Ligand binder design. Sequence first.
Ligand SMILES: O=C(O)CCC(CCC(=O)O)C(=O)O
Length: 197
Amino acid sequence: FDGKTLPRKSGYTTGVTNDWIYFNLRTGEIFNALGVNRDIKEGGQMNRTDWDLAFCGYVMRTNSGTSGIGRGGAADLGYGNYENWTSVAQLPSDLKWVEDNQEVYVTMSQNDWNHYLIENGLDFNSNPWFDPNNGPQKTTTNANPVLAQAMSFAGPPPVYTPSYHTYVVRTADGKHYFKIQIISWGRLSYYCDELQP
Ligand SMILES: O=C(O)CCC(CCC(=O)O)C(=O)O
């Protein structure tokens, strides 16, 4: 595969629900590349603009809306044709830009689920983490509802399939545009390249 992968095992299998690998798409910097919360812990990203895109497994976060203070966002350029998007001039005039909100689901780690029961005095016997036919508990987080479409859900039982859409991520400064396409997914394969003005 001639494209990009994340530097490590990402998301709930680490034991942490909000396990985010942060990319500064303009500078090439990567945060939490070595391990979880190693450079930036959940909530510690909201007031930094030195990141543009973060991944928690295949789920993506931009520096916008509820995830951060920046001028970012995401938009959907439709099925395929990744190599064909080269220029900001090609973007539709009426393109719908969407900022991050707190309505996107990530899988809860088994350990976070357990703490959630202890903290709320809930009986483990009537609160299983893992549904034998529906898989693990999920919870909402700050993420991008447009980029969440990069992996289509069908179920139960849940099965995830790439949409193969090209998406476009606006950077934290609001003046740079990165096309992105998720090819496969705990190892993630994708393409991400800057569009020309
Ligand atoms: O600790 C949290 O993230 C909250 C845990 C809760 C769990 C509730 C559920 O999944 O039914 C939630 O989803 O917000």
